[PDB]
Design a protein around this nucleic acid. Structure first.
Ligand SMILES: [Mg+2]
Ligand SMILES: [Mg+2]
Ligand SMILES: [Mg+2]
Ligand SMILES: [Mg+2]
Lengths: 174, 80, 68, 110
RNA sequence: ACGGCCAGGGCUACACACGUGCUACAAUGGUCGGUACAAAGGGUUGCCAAGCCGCGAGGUGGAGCUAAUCCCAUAAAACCGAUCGUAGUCCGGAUCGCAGUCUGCAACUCGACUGCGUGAAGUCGGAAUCGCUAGUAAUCGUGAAUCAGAAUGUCACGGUG
RNA sequence: UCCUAAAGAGUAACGGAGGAGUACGAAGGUGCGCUCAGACCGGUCGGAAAUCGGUCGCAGAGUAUAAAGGCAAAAGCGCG
């Protein structure tokens, strides 16, 4: 459990590290949203359920299908109304899913670097993209279809992205 | 090509014109019709005017060009 | 958390080739070993090294001596 | 992930290792001779014990993600130098010295 | 100088169309390990053995030799046992990157081979169109002319048929 | 529906501009919950843009339907 590592080690360390005043000013991970983009195969009506099932297993939680709000004629028509699949994970699930990252999903990018440290929002929210859906426990390779565009979007209670870097480097995976 | 038993190659006139010209550092280009000679670590940073076939074209010698011969940097046919 | 919506989320053991046992709560419902973990990846072990850039100078001296 | 990339099943060890994209047929035989894995048995019949040794052997030759990077850098070394070998390479003409008048169709498509 | 001598370059360029030729697209087959039989020819300005070191192309070595004597020189297809199970694949080899050997004063334009990696188009091919009536077509080898080096063409004869 | 129409109504011209001869069994009724458009940063085959996170917003969106007048008790959005 990463919560026990965070409360015991990271929380008291960051206060004196960042010259913070009291205990609770330290940044913490707000939520984790995945948002598997099902933009490809708009007029299919067959891959939405497959993506829902694939994302259900790697998160232990039923996702929600996301509809459109406009119509890009260059992109596709509104006939394929469901385009997206989204999941939200708070502390009970966030710190347990985050164990896959930095422990066993670092062998998941097939990379030279774990994750670039130059990708941050103005307020300190981190985002990352996972290329392949093969990378997870309890997932077959023959039965799985290799069409899964998955993101991992992070939210943090940081005023600016330097606090986000300081929080991330604790459970570091750059 | 050019097995290691007889490893290096450099034409005698080019060698005597470049080794001596290293003493008086680069103030002019070296005009030479020979294209069969390799370039060497002793000839890094010089200016060689290799013969294209109707005129001599300058060559900027770099440290990463030592393996390749001079003629690779001079054209033969245009195809504009 | 809704009752009859989520899958079965139980506790399993993740064992790497080096023997790093990690207690992970997942939907797996069984233990499966892994080939590489965070402690065995070359990048986080410092063994990724570099693409070596280019060594023609080196190569030429290794290839051809050229006395004098 | 299985050995760096996904490996097929129901096939012999040497043929299975050929898909690692950096070990061919002869070097796969040398890896099997060094490790001790019998090619006659399928990868399914193998245990999960010596696959770490197979991964160690794979981690001493090359992996595709860096082999493509370094071969592209080798191409870039010719392409940024002014050599004729790269001069034809950019345009897509034959490089080793094949005839260009006709039948140089593999590097130019239909 | 439309005559000569010397350097490089060029005749092997390259969106394209045509003739000839070799590879394939596989299971009458692909690899691995055993085992059988040829003809014809070239070699004292040459063949260049054995031992020997090299993953291999090869390096040393110097015999015998002026030819039923010695070398080139192991013929391959077939046959015996194993695996592959028809899958763009233990098919296919083009392409490209790295590393070498041999010849040559000299292998970039612009040579032939060897070692590792990559792995494409190609699933029997339109109108049309060609060779062949018997050791014939089909398919598999061997050695030579030109030749410092360089053959899918070409020089010559043989296996199964 | 707006102007001509002159700050109550009304007011003509073969005067200037636009629409209708319908739709909804939920597009109605009630209870409970939620913000819009647009700009920027980040995020794998998408990229100025699809789906996601954050901030700046402070209705410049939306109204089933033409324009006018209104809509944070939202008159807009979802669920029983
Ligand atoms: Mg010859
Ligand atoms: Mg009035
Ligand atoms: Mg009035
Ligand atoms: Mg309404």
């Amino acid at each position: 459990r990463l919560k026990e590592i965070y409360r015991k080690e990271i929380a008291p360390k960051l206060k004196e590290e960042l010259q913070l005043a009291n205990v609770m000013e330290v940044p913490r991970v707000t939520k984790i949203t995945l948002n598997m983009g099902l933009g490809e195969a708009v007029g299919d009506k067959k891959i939405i359920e497959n993506a829902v099932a694939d994302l259900e297993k790697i998160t232990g939680q039923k996702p929600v299908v996301t509809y459109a709000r406009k119509s890009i004629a260059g992109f596709k028509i509104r006939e394929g109304w469901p385009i997206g699949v989204k999941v939200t994970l708070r502390s009970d699930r966030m710190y347990e899913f985050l164990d896959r990252l930095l422990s066993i999903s670092l062998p998941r990018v097939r990379d030279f670097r774990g994750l670039n440290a130059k990708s941050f929002d103005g307020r300190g929210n981190y985002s990352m993209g996972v290329k392949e859906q093969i990378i997870f426990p309890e997932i077959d390779y023959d039965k799985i279809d290799a069409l899964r565009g998955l993101d991992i979007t992070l939210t943090t209670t940081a005023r600016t992205d330097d606090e986000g870097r300081a929080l991330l480097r604790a459970f570091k995976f750059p | 090509p050019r097995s290691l038993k007889k490893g290096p190659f450099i034409d005698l006139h080019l060698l005597k014109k470049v080794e001596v010209a290293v003493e008086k550092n680069d103030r002019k280009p070296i005009k030479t019709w020979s294209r069969r000679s390799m370039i060497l670590p002793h000839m890094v940073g010089l200016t060689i005017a290799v013969h294209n076939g109707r005129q001599h074209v300058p060559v900027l010698v770099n440290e990463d060009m030592v393996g390749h011969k001079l003629g690779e940097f001079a054209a033969t046919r245009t195809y504009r | 958390m809704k009752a009859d919506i989520h899958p079965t989320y139980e506790a399993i053991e993740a064992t790497c080739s080096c023997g790093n046992v990690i207690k992970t709560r997942s939907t797996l419902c069984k233990p499966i070993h892994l080939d590489v973990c965070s402690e065995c990846h070359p990048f986080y072990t410092g063994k990724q090294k570099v693409l070596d850039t280019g060594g023609r100078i080196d190569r030429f001296k290794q290839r051809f001596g050229v006395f004098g | 992930r299985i050995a760096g990339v996904n490996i097929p099943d129901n096939k012999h060890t040497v043929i299975s290792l050929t898909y690692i994209y950096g070990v061919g047929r002869t070097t796969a035989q040398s890896i099997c001779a060094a490790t001790g894995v019998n090619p006659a048995a399928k990868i399914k019949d193998l245990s999960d014990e010596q696959i770490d040794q197979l991964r160690n052997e794979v981690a001493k030759i090359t992996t595709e993600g860096d082999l493509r990077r370094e071969i592209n850098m080798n191409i870039k070394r010719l392409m940024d130098l002014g050599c004729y070998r790269g001069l034809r390479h950019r345009r897509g003409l034959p490089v080793r010295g094949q005839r260009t008048k006709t039948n140089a169709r593999t590097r130019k498509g239909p």
